[PDB]
Design a binder for this molecule. Sequence first.
Ligand SMILES: Nc1nc2[nH]nc(CCC(=O)O)c(=O)c2c(=O)[nH]1
Ligand SMILES: Nc1nc2[nH]nc(CCC(=O)O)c(=O)c2c(=O)[nH]1
Lengths: 259, 259
Amino acid sequence: KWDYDLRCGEYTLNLNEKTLIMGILNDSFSDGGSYNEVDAAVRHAKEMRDEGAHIIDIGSVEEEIKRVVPMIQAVSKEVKLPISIDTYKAEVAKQAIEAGAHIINDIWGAKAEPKIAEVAAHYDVPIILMHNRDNMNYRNLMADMIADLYDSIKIAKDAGVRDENIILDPGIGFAKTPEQNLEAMRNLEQLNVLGYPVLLGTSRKSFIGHVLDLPVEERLEGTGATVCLGIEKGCEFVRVHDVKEMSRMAKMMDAMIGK
Amino acid sequence: KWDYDLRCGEYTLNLNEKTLIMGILNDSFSDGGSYNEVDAAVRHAKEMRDEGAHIIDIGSVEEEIKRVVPMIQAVSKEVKLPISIDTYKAEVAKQAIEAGAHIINDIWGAKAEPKIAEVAAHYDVPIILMHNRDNMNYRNLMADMIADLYDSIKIAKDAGVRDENIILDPGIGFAKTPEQNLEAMRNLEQLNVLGYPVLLGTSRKSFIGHVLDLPVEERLEGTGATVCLGIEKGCEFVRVHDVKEMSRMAKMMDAMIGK
Ligand SMILES: Nc1nc2[nH]nc(CCC(=O)O)c(=O)c2c(=O)[nH]1
Ligand SMILES: Nc1nc2[nH]nc(CCC(=O)O)c(=O)c2c(=O)[nH]1
């Protein structure tokens, strides 16, 4: 039970009533801004909003800014929903919050560019710290993830990030072998000891294919399974591609566990 | 971990390698036997077999026999898979095992017709005892289910049913209000204390509709959720309509829990 709300500027996400669904949002001849790109992005944001999403996830440094900023301007204007920027770069994160993004989403947990934590602290936005490393050489998988995530928190907190603006992510499908991904899934509740909300990103990932022997477009039931087990282990967010399907699955879980 | 195998005549089901999927099998102008009925039933058994099922569930006393026997004769002849007979009637169960059914499936847990337990004992077949009662007046839901199931076991055991041929079923969607169905789902692990394999039948049931507000044909993600939570609480079998989808979901769960 959370004694606070996730504060994202205009919108506020309660962490107790339901599992929050973060939808993953989708051009040559262009460096960024086109009518085809930004319109296709808006149609997708609109659709995801209609089918249950609570957050929209939008994700060459000069290029990244000129691609992603126009998309954030449009979607935040036209879809009444908090937006997260999927970057590990300090400068891109700044840009995106300027252009209207509400939440930062760092796949390197402030280790790639520590200054990103300083960006987060400054704009007073929620930051997702995902587990990652440049190797798969674990002494004890869970004990090391928790160790590594903790170092991400230290960087965030030293930078002035408030406890309430910190969300953790086990980084499934990162620096982990098929068997190590399943181990983290099996032991996800361990992350709860750190005292922070947890986000789970497993949608359509490679290890589902390893188990089911099924290609990326055939991983819906597999995704569902990982979402269900994640919610049962106390996840606050799930980052999925199939918003309609996962929303229903999340909703039925919530009823059963009594969230 | 089970130190024995579920013995069903010609076929043997191991209870440790995977969650066993039981598929639910599907005429006017006829009292039983027609070419349309039994062929449509065989096509369905064949399909379910092809998409992951491990058991086929086939389910006016004179009528019941003349309807169900011809279907069992055909399916057991043409599909290499154990068959269960979904009845609570002693005479129908006898007939069906004579006609080739391998497992009895009693929705009244030997309380409607105690002589059915005697049928089961005699042919030495596995029997599923499902929780049921003629009222919803519970002191303590779980404590009462376990009490009631135990009385089913007493009838079975007095009749000569061996411990290894007994499987339990919480009887979700029976004698339980929408809120009581969710409570049993939340507390399913409690059934494990009785020492018997558990089968979970929640496919497309009314309470999924109550939660999701969705009609019977729109309850696939909801079913999945109940299956995933059930496997996580240690179910050995799931009784589902959507064999393709649930098999994949069962398989991905099994990988994650380490079954
Ligand atoms: N927080 C978080 N951010 C991500 N960004 N990008 C990716 C990669 C894109 C995709 O494969 O889903 C990802 O998996 C995650 C994640 O699991 N979690
Ligand atoms: N063991 C068992 N047998 C059944 N027979 N028939 C039914 C009813 C048919 C259907 O609605 O699925 C059932 O739900 C069960 C069950 O949940 N479990």
